[PDB]
Amino acid sequence: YMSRYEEITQQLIFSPKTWLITGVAGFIGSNLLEKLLKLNQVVIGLDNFSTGHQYNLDEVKTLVSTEQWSRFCFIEGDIRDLTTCEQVMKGVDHVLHQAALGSVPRSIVDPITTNATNITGFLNILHAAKNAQVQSFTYAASSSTYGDHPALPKVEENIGNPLSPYAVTKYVNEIYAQVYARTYGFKTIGLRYFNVFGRRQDPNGAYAAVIPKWTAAMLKGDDVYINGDGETSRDFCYIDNVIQMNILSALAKDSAKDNIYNVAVGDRTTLNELSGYIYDELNLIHHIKYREFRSGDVRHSQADVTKAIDLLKYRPNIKIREGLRLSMPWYVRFLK
Amino acid sequence: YMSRYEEITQQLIFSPKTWLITGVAGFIGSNLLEKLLKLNQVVIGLDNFSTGHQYNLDEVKTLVSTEQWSRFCFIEGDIRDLTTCEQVMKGVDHVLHQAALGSVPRSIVDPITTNATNITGFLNILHAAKNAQVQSFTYAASSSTYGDHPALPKVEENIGNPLSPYAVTKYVNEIYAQVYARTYGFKTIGLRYFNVFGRRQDPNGAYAAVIPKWTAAMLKGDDVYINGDGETSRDFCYIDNVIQMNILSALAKDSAKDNIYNVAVGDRTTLNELSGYIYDELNLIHHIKYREFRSGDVRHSQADVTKAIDLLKYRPNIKIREGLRLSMPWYVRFLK
Ligand SMILES: NC(=O)c1ccc[n+]([C@@H]2O[C@H](COP(=O)([O-])OP(=O)(O)OC[C@H]3O[C@@H](n4cnc5c(N)ncnc54)[C@H](O)[C@@H]3O)[C@@H](O)[C@H]2O)c1
Ligand SMILES: NC(=O)c1ccc[n+]([C@@H]2O[C@H](COP(=O)([O-])OP(=O)(O)OC[C@H]3O[C@@H](n4cnc5c(N)ncnc54)[C@H](O)[C@@H]3O)[C@@H](O)[C@H]2O)c1
Numbered sequence: 298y299m300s301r302y303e304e305i306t307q308q309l310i311f312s313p314k315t316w317l318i319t320g321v322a323g324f325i326g327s328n329l330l331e332k333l334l335k336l337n338q339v340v341i342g343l344d345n346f347s348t349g350h351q352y353n354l355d356e357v358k359t360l361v362s363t364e365q366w367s368r369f370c371f372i373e374g375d376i377r378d379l380t381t382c383e384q385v386m387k388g389v390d391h392v393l394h395q396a397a398l399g400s401v402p403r404s405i406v407d408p409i410t411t412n413a414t415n416i417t418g419f420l421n422i423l424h425a426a427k428n429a430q431v432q433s434f435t436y437a438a439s440s441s442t443y444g445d446h447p448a449l450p451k452v453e454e455n456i457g458n459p460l461s462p463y464a465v466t467k468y469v470n471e472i473y474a475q476v477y478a479r480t481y482g483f484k485t486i487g488l489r490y491f492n493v494f495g496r497r498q499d500p501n502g503a504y505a506a507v508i509p510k511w512t513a514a515m516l517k518g519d520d521v522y523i524n525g526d527g528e529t530s531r532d533f534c535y536i537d538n539v540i541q542m543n544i545l546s547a548l549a550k551d552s553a554k555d556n557i558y559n560v561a562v563g564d565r566t567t568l569n570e571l572s573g574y575i576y577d578e579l580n581l582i583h584h585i586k587y588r589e590f591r592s593g594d595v596r597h598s599q600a601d602v603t604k605a606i607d608l609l610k611y612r613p614n615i616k617i618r619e620g621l622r623l624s625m626p627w628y629v630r631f632l633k
Numbered sequence: 634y635m636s637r638y639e640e641i642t643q644q645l646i647f648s649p650k651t652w653l654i655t656g657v658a659g660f661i662g663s664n665l666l667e668k669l670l671k672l673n674q675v676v677i678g679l680d681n682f683s684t685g686h687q688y689n690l691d692e693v694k695t696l697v698s699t700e701q702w703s704r705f706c707f708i709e710g711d712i713r714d715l716t717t718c719e720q721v722m723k724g725v726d727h728v729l730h731q732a733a734l735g736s737v738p739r740s741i742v743d744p745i746t747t748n749a750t751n752i753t754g755f756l757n758i759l760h761a762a763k764n765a766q767v768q769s770f771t772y773a774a775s776s777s778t779y780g781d782h783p784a785l786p787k788v789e790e791n792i793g794n795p796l797s798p799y800a801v802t803k804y805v806n807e808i809y810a811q812v813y814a815r816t817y818g819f820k821t822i823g824l825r826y827f828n829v830f831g832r833r834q835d836p837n838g839a840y841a842a843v844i845p846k847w848t849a850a851m852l853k854g855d856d857v858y859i860n861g862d863g864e865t866s867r868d869f870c871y872i873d874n875v876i877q878m879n880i881l882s883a884l885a886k887d888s889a890k891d892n893i894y895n896v897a898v899g900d901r902t903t904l905n906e907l908s909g910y911i912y913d914e915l916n917l918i919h920h921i922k923y924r925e926f927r928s929g930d931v932r933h934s935q936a937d938v939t940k941a942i943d944l945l946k947y948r949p950n951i952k953i954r955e956g957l958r959l960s961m962p963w964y965v966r967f968l969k
Contacts, residue, residue: 409757465809
C-alpha cells in the first residue's frame, strides 16, 4: 500500500489541476502523462522529439479513456526558447520538468548542445514558472551528481566532484533552484533519479540505458557487452516509484519544498547479477562479453531514501526483480 | 619590483605570443589590452559592446604606437555564438576570458540574460580553446563564489552557497573548468576577483561600482550614498594587480594550473574609510547621505592571497591608497 500517495491522488481526482510536463514524449514524461490523465488532470505537454517519440504519445492515448485524452494539450516546441516556455506556462498549477538530453557519454561528446538543453532550457522553464506563479515545481535531477563521493549509501547532503558535464548540468539545476527559493521565495523540489527503468524506455540508439539495451539484444540473440569488470553496481528503480515521487512532490507541504530527494529503492545490483536477472525473466516468457570501462561513468550507486520516506511519506513498493517482470512483456510487444 | 612578473614581462617583449582577450572593450579587458600591446604582443579581441565601450578601445589606441596597435585584431561579436568563439581562437596561445555580465542586481532582474553570457558564453569559449588546444586558459571568476561561508579572510578551498543568479554563473565557470581538466586534460586557472578598481571602470549606469560612482558624484557635487551604516568592508584591488595575476596565470607551470586563486590585496577597507580616502586624494587635485543596506549585500569581504603569493609568485604591491592616487587623474579627465 502506498498510503500517502493514495490519499494525494484522491485529492487530485476530486479537485483536478492543470499540470505541465516537459519531456512528455520521452520515457518518464510519457509515464507521468499516463498516470495524470488517468487521474482526470488537465495536462499540457511540451516536447521537441529529440530523444522523445510521437509513438510514446500514441501508446498513452490507447491506455486512457477518450474524455481523459481530451484534457491533454500537446505542444511541439523547445525549452531553449523562452517564448514557448512562457506560452506553455499559462494557467499551469503544477510543473513537472523532465525535458533534458540525458546520458553521461552524450555530455562528454557534445557538452554544448547538452548545456543549452539542460541548463538554459531548465532556467527558461524555471523562470517562466516563477513568473506564472505556479503552485509547485518539481524537476528531474540525477544521482550522477554524487560523482566520486565514496560513501554508500548516498545521502542527499553529501556529494563529491562531478565526473561528467552531465553531472554538472544537473547539479546546476539544483543550485539555480536553491537560489530561486532564496531570491524569489520560489520553492521547488529536485528529484535525483537513480537508474530508472520500465515501459517506454528507449532500447534503440547509441545512448540506450543498460536495461532496455540488454533486453533488446537478448531477444535478438545478439551479444551482451559489459563496460569493465561487471562489478560496477546500481540502484535500479522502476518507473512507478518515480511517478509516486513526482506526484507527492507536486503536492508536498511547503516545508518539504526547497529540498532535494533521492528517488530509488535502496538496493544494490551489480551488472553481473542484472545480466542474470533479465535473462531469467525473459526466459519465463519463452525465447556475454567484457570490454573496457565507460569514461566519466560512476563506480557504485546505492540510494538512501530515508529522507523522502520521512518528509514525503514515500513508500517504494516495486523492487528490481518485480519491475523487470512488469517490463519484459512491454519490450516483447514493442521490439517484435 | 615585481621579480617573477617582471621576468615574465621581459620574456614577452622578446618572444611575442598571440593572446585572445574576451571583454576587451571593458574595464579589465581594455587594461589587459593596454599592457599586452605595450609589450608588443599579438592580441585578438572579442566584444559585443554590451557593457563595454568603443571609446575604451579609442583610449588604448592613443596610448600605444601605431605598430603596436597594428597587432590588435578587433572582432565585434558575441561569446554566445560558438562559431565566432572558434574563429577568434585559431592560432591563439593564451586565453584571457573576461567577457561576462557583472552585477548581482542585474542578475536578479534578468537571470536569463546573465545565464546566457556567463555560462553558455563561458562554456563556448572554454570548449573552443579546448578544441584549438591553446597553451593557457585563464578566466575571470568572482569572490561571490564564497556565498554564505562565514570565514574571513576568504580562503579558496572553503566556499558556501551561492547567493544570487550571478553567483551561480561564476561558480559554474569553476565547475566546468574542473570538469574540462578531468575529462579532456585541459587545465585552466580561474581568478576570483575582489572589488577591482582603476582607469576605465565605468562610473555611469545603474550598476556602477562604488569607487567610480562616488568619484563621479564628488566631482559633480551629487549625493554620496552609503548603503547601510558604513562599516561594511571590502578588499579593493587596483587593476595593475589583476593585470599581474592574469599574465602570471597565462604563463604558469602545469602544476600551478587547474587551480583557483583569490586576486586581491589581503586588506579590508570600510566604506566610511573609503569615502574619506576618495575625498582626500580628489582634493589634492583641487575640486554624504545614509540609507538602507542594499538587499543581499555582503557585510565583510577580505581575501587571503597566500596561495597566489605562494604558487604563482604574486605580489600585491598596490594598496588602496596608492591605487586611488593613480586613478583619480583618469577620472578628472574622463569627466570634464
Ligand atoms: N532515465 C534515467 O535513468 C534518468 C536518470 C537520471 C536523470 N534522468 C533525467 O530524467 C529526465 C527524463 O529522462 P528520460 O529517462 O525520460 O529520457 P528521455 O530521453 O526518454 O526523455 C527526455 C525527453 O525530453 C525531450 N527533450 C529533450 N530536450 C528537449 C528540449 N530542448 N525541448 C523540449 N523537449 C526536449 C526529449 O524529446 C525526450 O522526450 C531527464 O532530465 C533525464 O536527464 C533520467
Ligand atoms: N570589476 C570587478 O570588481 C569584478 C569582480 C568580480 C568579477 N569581475 C569579472 O571580471 C570580468 C570583466 O569585468 P569588468 O569589471 O571589466 O566588466 P566590464 O563590464 O567593464 O567588461 C565586461 C566586458 O565583456 C563584454 N561582454 C559582455 N557580454 C559579452 C558577450 N556575450 N560577448 C562578447 N562580449 C561580452 C562587455 O561588452 C564588456 O566589454 C567579468 O567577467 C566580471 O564578471 C569583475
